[PDB]
Amino acid sequence: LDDGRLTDGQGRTVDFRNTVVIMTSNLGVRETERKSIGLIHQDNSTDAMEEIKKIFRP
Amino acid sequence: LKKYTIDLTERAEQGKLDPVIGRDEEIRRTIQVLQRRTKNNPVLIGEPGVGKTAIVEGLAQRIINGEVPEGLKGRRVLALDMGALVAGAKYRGEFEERLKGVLNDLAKQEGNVILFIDALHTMAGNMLKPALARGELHCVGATTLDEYRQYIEKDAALERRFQKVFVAEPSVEDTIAILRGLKERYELHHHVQITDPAIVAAATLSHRYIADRQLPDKAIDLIDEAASSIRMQIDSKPEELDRLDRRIIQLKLEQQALMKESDEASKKRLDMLNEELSDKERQYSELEEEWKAEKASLSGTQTIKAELEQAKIAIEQARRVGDLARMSELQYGKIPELEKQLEAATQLEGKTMRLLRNKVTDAEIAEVLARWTGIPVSRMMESEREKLLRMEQELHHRVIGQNEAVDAVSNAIRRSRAGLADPNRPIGSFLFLGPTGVGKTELCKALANFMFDSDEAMVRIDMSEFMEKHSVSRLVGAPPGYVGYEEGGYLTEAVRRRPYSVILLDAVEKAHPDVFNILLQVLDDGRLTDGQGRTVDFRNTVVIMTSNLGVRETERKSIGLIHQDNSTDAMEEIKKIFRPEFINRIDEVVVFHPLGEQHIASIAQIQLKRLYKRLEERGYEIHISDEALKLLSENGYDPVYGARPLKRAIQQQIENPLAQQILSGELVPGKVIRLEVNEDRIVAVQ
Amino acid sequence: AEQGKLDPVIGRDEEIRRTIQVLQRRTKNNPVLIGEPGVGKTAIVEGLAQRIINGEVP
Amino acid sequence: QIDSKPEELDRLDRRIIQLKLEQQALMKESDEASKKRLDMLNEELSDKERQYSELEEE
Ligand SMILES: Nc1ncnc2c1ncn2[C@@H]1O[C@H](COP(=O)(O)OP(=O)(O)OP(O)(O)=S)[C@@H](O)[C@H]1O
Numbered sequence: 001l002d003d004g005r006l007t008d009g010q011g012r013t014v015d016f017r018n019t020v021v022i023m024t025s026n027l028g029v030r031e032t033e034r035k036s037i038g039l040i041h042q043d044n045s046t047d048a049m050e051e052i053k054k055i056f057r058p
Numbered sequence: 059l060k061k062y063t064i065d066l067t068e069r070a071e072q073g074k075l076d077p078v079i080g081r082d083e084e085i086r087r088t089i090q091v092l093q094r095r096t097k098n099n100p101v102l103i104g105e106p107g108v109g110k111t112a113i114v115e116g117l118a119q120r121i122i123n124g125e126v127p128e129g130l131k132g133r134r135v136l137a138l139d140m141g142a143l144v145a146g147a148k149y150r151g152e153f154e155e156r157l158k159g160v161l162n163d164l165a166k167q168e169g170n171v172i173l174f175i176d177a178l179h180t181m182a183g184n185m186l187k188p189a190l191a192r193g194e195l196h197c198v199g200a201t202t203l204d205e206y207r208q209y210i211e212k213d214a215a216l217e218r219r220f221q222k223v224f225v226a227e228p229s230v231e232d233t234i235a236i237l238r239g240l241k242e243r244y245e246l247h248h249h250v251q252i253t254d255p256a257i258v259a260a261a262t263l264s265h266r267y268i269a270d271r272q273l274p275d276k277a278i279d280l281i282d283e284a285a286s287s288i289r290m291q292i293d294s295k296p297e298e299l300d301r302l303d304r305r306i307i308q309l310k311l312e313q314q315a316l317m318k319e320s321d322e323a324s325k326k327r328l329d330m331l332n333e334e335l336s337d338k339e340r341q342y343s344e345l346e347e348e349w350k351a352e353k354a355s356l357s358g359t360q361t362i363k364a365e366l367e368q369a370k371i372a373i374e375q376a377r378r379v380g381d382l383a384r385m386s387e388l389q390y391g392k393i394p395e396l397e398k399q400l401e402a403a404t405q406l407e408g409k410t411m412r413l414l415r416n417k418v419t420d421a422e423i424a425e426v427l428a429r430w431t432g433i434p435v436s437r438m439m440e441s442e443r444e445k446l447l448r449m450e451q452e453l454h455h456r457v458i459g460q461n462e463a464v465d466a467v468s469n470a471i472r473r474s475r476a477g478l479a480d481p482n483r484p485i486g487s488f489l490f491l492g493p494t495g496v497g498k499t500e501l502c503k504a505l506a507n508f509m510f511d512s513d514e515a516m517v518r519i520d521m522s523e524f525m526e527k528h529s530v531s532r533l534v535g536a537p538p539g540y541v542g543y544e545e546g547g548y549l550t551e552a553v554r555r556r557p558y559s560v561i562l563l564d565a566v567e568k569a570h571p572d573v574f575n576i577l578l579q580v581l582d583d584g585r586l587t588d589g590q591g592r593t594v595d596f597r598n599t600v601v602i603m604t605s606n607l608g609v610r611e612t613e614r615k616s617i618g619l620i621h622q623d624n625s626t627d628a629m630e631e632i633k634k635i636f637r638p639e640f641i642n643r644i645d646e647v648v649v650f651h652p653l654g655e656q657h658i659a660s661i662a663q664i665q666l667k668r669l670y671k672r673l674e675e676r677g678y679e680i681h682i683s684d685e686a687l688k689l690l691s692e693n694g695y696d697p698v699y700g701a702r703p704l705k706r707a708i709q710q711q712i713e714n715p716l717a718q719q720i721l722s723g724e725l726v727p728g729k730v731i732r733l734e735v736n737e738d739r740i741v742a743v744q
Numbered sequence: 745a746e747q748g749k750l751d752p753v754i755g756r757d758e759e760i761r762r763t764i765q766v767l768q769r770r771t772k773n774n775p776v777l778i779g780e781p782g783v784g785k786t787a788i789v790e791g792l793a794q795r796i797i798n799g800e801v802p
Numbered sequence: 803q804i805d806s807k808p809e810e811l812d813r814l815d816r817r818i819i820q821l822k823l824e825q826q827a828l829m830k831e832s833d834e835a836s837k838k839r840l841d842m843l844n845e846e847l848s849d850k851e852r853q854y855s856e857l858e859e860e
Contacts, residue, residue: 007548007551010544011545011551127806128806129805129806278772279772283768283769286765290768386829386830429758
């Protein structure tokens with residue numbers, strides 16, 4: 001995510017400079033079911049960002 | 059004895075030895091070990107390049123200069139030659155025929171012969187044991203540290219016999235003394251001269267920088283390679299000579315182009331070409347005549363070099379064998395005459411040698427070394443104090459902004475490199491507050507590129523990175539003796555390219571107080587006992603520690619207001635959350651701020667400089683207005699992250715529509731773009 | 745190289761003078777060209793040999 | 803230490819060998835009149851030969 005490279009086993013890198021890493025996430029489902037509609041979007045950015053802060057890095 | 063063994067009486071007597079310099083401790087230890095009644099097979103712990111074979115050459119200068127004690131005199135010491143023992147073996151098994159014949163005659167010799175095994179670690183293994191164990195011979199050895207550690211300790215009678223002696227690589231002034239003792243063979247073998255600061259700077263800087271190679275080995279690479287460079291380029295013809303040689307060969311070929319004519323009155327113009335040919339031939343003849351004049355000085359000094367080395371070998375052999383009239387004959391007589399007209403020969407090269415340079419100085423060492431390494435020579439021409447006082451200028455070449463950071467951090471680096479902190483500290487004891495993406499990695503690249511000379515030099519640590527207690531075992535990899543000798547440590551990789559590091563220790567306050575104590579051991583003592591327990595010198599490591607406490611008020615207090623206000627009321631928060639010991643550790647408190655209005659315009663236009671060059675290759679030139687980039691700015695200025703959705707709103711707001719407008723056919727290349735001012739969504743117009 | 749069946753070594757003079765300075769050394773005399781291949785190691789040897797046969801060699 | 807010779811006979815032996823190697827150089831003299839000075843070196847040299855005889859007898 002910083003480089004588009006991956007320092008693999010022998011000491012080389014892996015060429016990721018022109019491809020895309022993709023990740024479907026199973027966390028913010030019911031939070032999105034709570035924000036829509038009638039609840040503010042940045043509130044779900046807030047507390048969904050909070051459980052991300054329990055489980056991810058920013 | 060004879061055909062496959064050689065007496066060192068006649069090898070040290072013949073003098074196949076390079077001169078040695080003051081090798082006292084190891085040779086006297088060799089004497090007292092060789093006077094033990096058993097385990098008198100001393101093994102020298104070291105590698106060649108400290109000159110272990112040369113230490114044996116000097117013990118042979120103490121046999122042949124008579125400087126050995128009463129114990130080791132009278133002994134008739136014959137050396138084995140396995141390279142002679144391979145001779146006469148055709149059918150399979152005659153080398154060990156002649157080898158056990160060596161066991162026959164050195165068996166009957168019964169103690170008369172001390173053995174020296176050149177390259178002991180040639181000496182198999184089950185058959186070297188019974189002759190020594192019965193006592194049939196007497197030898198001396200030498201091998202590598204690691205080879206020795208895998209050599210003695212296991213076997214019973216092998217650690218009974220083979221013996222430890224501390225022999226090491228010297229300090230500065232002793233390697234200086236070795237190069238002084240060897241400039242006899244250097245100068246009088248390599249057609250060169252050597253002065254004292256070349257030896258002092260060679261042994262000193264070679265001692266300091268390269269902790270890899272050996273002393274005086276790498277200085278032997280310098281004097282050997284560079285001295286032959288001086289001899290070789292002295293053999294070459296000078297520069298004005300071959301400038302004029304190219305000009306006369308072009309003028310002769312053009313004269314041949316002028317002689318073959320069809321129209322006479324147009325092609326008989328070559329008279330001025332002929333007189334210019336005569337003048338340039340005269341000048342080239344005079345300059346090559348000067349080259350032969352310097353070769354005449356080198357002719358006389360060449361034959362007096364030959365008779366000179368014959369003269370000092372004559373006075374030393376006169377010291378050795380002892381003819382009476384020949385000693386005083388040479389002493390008052392032949393050799394001081396060659397000393398006086400040797401001085402007249404040094405004045406002969408001191409007045410004849412104009413083009414070719416016989417004397418070797420540090421500049422040719424900077425030639426051979428400047429084409430060895432490849433690091434810029436101006437970085438050695440730089441001093442520390444000058445690149446401390448002129449740091450703001452080159453920091454204002456690349457990086458724009460951060461005035462109190464460059465000035466006050468420059469005060470911390472002038473204090474730190476000046477020594478105005480505790481010298482038991484790392485280099486930069488910092489504390490940085492502010493958001494991410496304002497140039498911290500860019501500051502590591504800029505300082506790394508200036509004083510560390512790299513666009514590749516930064517590793518960064520946020521506290522959520524932390525590869526764990528097991529990870530120090532991961533960079534030592536497997537313990538030694540397991541699988542993984544193919545890689546081992548990737549310590550060898552990330553520390554292959556960068557021995558130093560500039561580290562961006564993010565969010566120091568959000569870490570545990572155990573990281574206030576581990577990082578207190580970082581800021582104190584200039585070294586950290588890590589999770590494994592060993593410690594590595596942080597005194598060659600700037601400990602840059604960054605943080606993200608007060609984001610919003612720092613994003614406000616940037617334009618117009620003084621920044622010492624933000625630093626001091628930041629320290630009103632720092633005093634509460636830290637101990638006063640941490641405030642004692644760091645020198646000053648610097649807080650990074652997001653830049654001002656015209657400098658935010660500098661940030662957006664620098665992020666669009668990629669678009670200027672990516673597009674100026676393809677044939678598009680934007681002249682973006684301040685108002686279209688301003689709609690990029692205020693449509694980018696989200697107070698959440700700072701300038702981090704500013705790139706998202708530049709590339710997403712214009713450039714994805716600008717990729718649709720350029721890549722659709724609306725923007726024709728070869729024409730100057732001005733990003734105009736419509737409604738708030740921005741549309742490029744040709 | 746005397747029949748002319750080969751190709752010239754053009755430019756890159758720090759490398760050719762580098763190997764020649766390695767050659768002229770007495771102790772540690774012989775060279776090794778070392779790199780990840782495809783930089784012209786035998787072709788740098790051809791830089792030496794073409795410099796020798798051209799007569800412009802020091 | 804039992805098998806060798808002590809220190810003061812080494813010091814006196816080196817200074818006597820040095821002065822008699824100076825004597826071999828000073829017998830073949832260039833100017834016999836201006837070089838009369840070595841008479842004290844001859845008398846003190848004979849004194850060192852007497853002391854050398856005593857110490858070597860010991
Ligand atoms: N700098 C260069 N100069 C000339 N040719 C080069 C260069 N770099 C790569 N090449 C090409 O790459 C090849 C590799 O160079 P070589 O002359 O074969 O040196 P090499 O690495 O010793 O290869 P060998 O002989 O198989 S070990 C050359 O034959 C050229 O086709």
